[PDB]
Design a protein around this ligand. Structure first.
Ligand SMILES: O=C(O)c1cc(C(=O)O)c(NCc2ccccc2C2CC2)cn1
Ligand SMILES: [Mn+2]
Length: 233
């Protein structure tokens, strides 16, 4: 079944029915009027950040992801517009600490204040990449508000209760990552994955997905996509 969509729910309503229990939800009417929703085009991102060095993750379309450095202009040029030869992702980067002028175009969701951490310790990451970027099925150690700004993203969510049916890697460095290709699972090797229930959604611009702490999430970009994630506790 699908992730429920709620429009500007109260802090208490979000705290009691989702944050505390750990239930995913899509929040509407919250970030749809953030400045990023009208300003951030490729033309705008180049003007404000084109000459800045950003980390980019590259990988083949069972291959393997390496990490390099290049200017935003370079990234867009040879991973977004010019019929890219490989997949490049400006992923998990604190672009807004590097570029404060872009931090004016977003805010911190008020729902974060319901956490036991400090606002200064919230990690804001930019996920800027082309159609086709795919995360592995994985779980993070903090709460997360995934704000979609450009394009859409298909996202699958498995509860932490389903960890057994997701076959996590046994190396400590990857114990938070699933061995299973979500959208083409090897059921002969990972049979328990087939009967694991899940939530799914297509996250579209203006929307915020609340990924509870340690909720397994799988993300695939359907179009040219720019997402901003808020990791908070
Ligand atoms: O908000 C979140 O928790 C979140 C969002 C995304 C996203 O792609 O939007 C995400 N993808 C990870 C991913 C994809 C493609 C190559 C590499 C990587 C890894 C970072 C090394 C993971 N986590
Ligand atoms: Mn994640």
């Amino acid at each position: 079944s699908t992730v429920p969509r709620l429009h500007r729910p109260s802090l208490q309503h979000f705290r009691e029915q989702f944050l505390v229990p750990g239930r995913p939800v899509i929040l509407k009417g919250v970030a749809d009027h953030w400045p990023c929703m009208q300003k951030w085009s490729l033309e705008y991102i180049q003007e404000i950040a084109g000459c800045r060095t950003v980390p980019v993750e590259v990988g083949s379309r069972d291959e393997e992801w390496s990490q390099t450095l290049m200017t935003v202009n370079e990234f867009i040029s040879k991973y977004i517009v010019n019929e890219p030869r490989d997949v490049g992702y400006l992923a998990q980067h604190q672009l807004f600490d590097q570029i404060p002028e872009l931090k004016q175009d977003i805010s911190i969701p008020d729902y974060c204040s319901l956490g036991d951490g400090e606002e200064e310790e919230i990690t804001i990451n930019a996920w800027f990449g082309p159609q086709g970027t795919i995360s592995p099925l994985h779980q993070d150690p903090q709460q997360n508000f995934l704000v979609q700004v450009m394009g859409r993203k298909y996202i699958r969510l498995y509860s932490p209760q389903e960890s057994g049916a997701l076959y996590p890697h046994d190396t400590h460095l990857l114990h938070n990552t699933s061995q299973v290709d979500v959208e083409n699972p090897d059921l002969e090797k990972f049979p328990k994955f087939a009967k694991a229930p899940f939530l799914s959604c297509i996250l579209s611009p203006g929307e915020i997905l609340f990924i509870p702490v340690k909720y397994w999430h799988y993300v695939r970009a359907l179009d040219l996509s720019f997402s901003v994630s808020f990791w908070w506790s």
